């Protein structure tokens, strides 16, 4: 009985810990979406092509 009670309690504890970690993670994602996407798209649209450096004439 002691084992079963402790196991149930610890299961609840770890579930809550995972839940709050996930929630804080979601909040941090919500904090920073537009900046990353703007940077990514802005540097993607760049091309700046060039030939292979070792080409000889």
């Amino acid at each position: 009985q002691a084992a079963m009670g402790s196991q149930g309690n610890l299961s609840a504890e770890v579930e809550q810990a995972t839940r709050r970690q996930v929630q804080g993670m979601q909040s941090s994602q919500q904090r920073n979406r537009e900046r990353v996407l703007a940077q990514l798209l802005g540097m993607v649209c760049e091309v700046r092509p060039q030939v292979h450096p070792n080409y000889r004439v």
């Binding site: 091309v47 060039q50 292979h52 070792n54």
Partner: protein, 462 residues
């Protein structure tokens, strides 16, 4: 970084064995990775081996079966094989190439690194000072392991070495003097192993609550040989990242490098280089040196790295190239004897031919205890005398013996009974081992302790 688009080719001149000849490649690189797409829709990968002119030959990890001469395609990464690395890799398992084995996701690339690694400036090397607790009476009391000491273990085939490695991993740790054990970590690497002794590892290491400080790699025997050669360098690089870029002390364990040598023979045969001694390339010495010398402490950092590999001795031959060279570039060795295994002693360690070159600094008063060195030396010497006395008894008979000989025989018997045998799960602290040693020492009377300084005898013997 790279901004140019990746290329694709379909020119396949031919195939010979596990290699594939291509042509019309613009500025191919030496060891750049490529992918393969069979016409039926399967995916593959390989590494460029040799390059000449516009031609470039490539080896394939998963085999060359089913390749079509005209209906295949390939793609060029345009870069050398890099690895994703991160401190959160703990608790995970991989297959050598980095593909997860468990049901977890792909590792986020906190950083990219070159697998080949770099040499270390000798000026920055710092002499190892401290000692790592292992939980085994033989490895801790009779011998020792410093923070940087590279100690291989020899063991003939069919003897229980994987069990020793597993118990070392389970019971690894640092000496509790009173920046704690949380800094310690483990990177375990097993190569060329049966599916048994692999399920065993992945299960047992999970069953003892230790995945919080373990990063594990598996490579079954049936896997590609190139995976085998690649894996240990991957392990060493992740160890270097976790130990030096982040302040940690890391214990790397390698299993059965003889299979690594076999893979080296494989790649040598593929390139058609002339074999030498016992069918091994001459440069394997320098190759093994590259896989070694990634240990020791470094100034400006508080971390450490320590390698403990394992080898399979062919037919108990010390003069075989593998163990001989390993001894030439390692600082000691621990033996495992067949007779002890037949005696049902779970740790079969034979501590007589073994020797650790850095005992004098790994222990001391600031370390585990002052009396440790004296106790160890006395134990070794009296065990040698006890074996000699058993040899004496073999002929002279028990009635021709003295009381001293009886003391030696009884001490020897109790010594293999208690000091050597541990049990598959008994995690002994260092102080406990020294206490057991003192109890065994007390059997002899005071005067015979020739190796013990008098002050220590007065302090501890009573």
């Amino acid at each position: 970084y790279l901004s140019q688009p990746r290329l694709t080719y379909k020119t396949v001149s031919g195939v010979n064995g596990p290699l594939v000849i291509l042509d019309h490649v613009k500025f191919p690189r030496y060891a750049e990775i490529v992918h393969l797409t069979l016409p039926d829709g399967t995916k593959r990968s390989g590494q460029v081996l040799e390059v000449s002119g516009s031609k470039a030959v490539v080896q394939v990890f998963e085999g060359t079966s089913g390749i079509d001469a005209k209906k295949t395609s390939c793609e060029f990464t345009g870069d050398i094989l890099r690895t994703p690395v991160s401190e959160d890799m703990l608790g995970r398992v991989f297959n050598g190439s980095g593909k997860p084995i468990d049901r977890g996701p792909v590792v986020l690339a906190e950083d990219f690194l070159d697998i080949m690694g770099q040499p270390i400036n000798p000026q920055c090397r710092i002499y190892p000072e401290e000692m790592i607790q292992t939980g085994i009476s033989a490895i801790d009391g009779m011998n020792s392991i410093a923070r940087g000491q590279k100690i291989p273990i020899f063991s003939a085939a069919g003897l229980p070495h994987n069990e020793i490695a597993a118990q070392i991993c389970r019971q690894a740790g640092l000496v509790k003097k009173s920046y704690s054990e949380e800094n310690f970590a483990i990177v375990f690497a097993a190569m060329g192993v049966n599916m048994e002794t692999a399920r065993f590892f992945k299960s047992d290491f999970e069953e003892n609550g230790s995945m919080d400080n373990v990063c594990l790699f598996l490579n079954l025997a049936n896997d590609p040989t190139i995976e085998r050669i690649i894996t240990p360098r991957l392990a060493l690089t992740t160890a270097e990242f976790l130990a030096y870029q982040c302040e940690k002390h890391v214990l790397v364990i390698l299993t059965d490098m003889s299979s690594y040598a076999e893979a080296l023979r494989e790649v040598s045969a593929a390139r058609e280089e002339v074999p030498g001694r016992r069918g091994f390339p001459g440069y394997m010495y320098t190759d093994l040196a590259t896989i070694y010398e990634r240990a020791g402490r470094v100034e400006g950092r508080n971390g450490s790295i320590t390698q403990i590999p394992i080898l399979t001795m062919p037919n108990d031959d010390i003069t075989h190239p593998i163990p001989d060279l390993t001894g030439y570039i390692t600082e000691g060795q621990i033996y495992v004897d067949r007779q002890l295994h037949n005696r049902q002693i779970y740790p079969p360690i034979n501590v007589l031919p073994s020797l650790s070159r850095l005992m004098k600094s790994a222990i001391g008063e600031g370390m585990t205890r002052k009396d440790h060195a004296d106790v160890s030396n006395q134990l070794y010497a009296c065990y040698a005398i006890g074996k000699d006395v058993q040899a004496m008894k073999a002929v002279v008979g028990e009635e021709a013996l003295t009381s001293d000989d009886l003391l030696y025989l009884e001490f020897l018997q109790k010594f293999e009974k208690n000091f050597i045998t541990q049990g598959p799960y008994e995690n002994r602290t260092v102080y406990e081992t020294l206490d057991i040693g003192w109890q065994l020492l007390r059997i002899f009377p005071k005067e015979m302790l020739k190796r013990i300084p008098q002050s220590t005898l007065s302090e501890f013997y009573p």
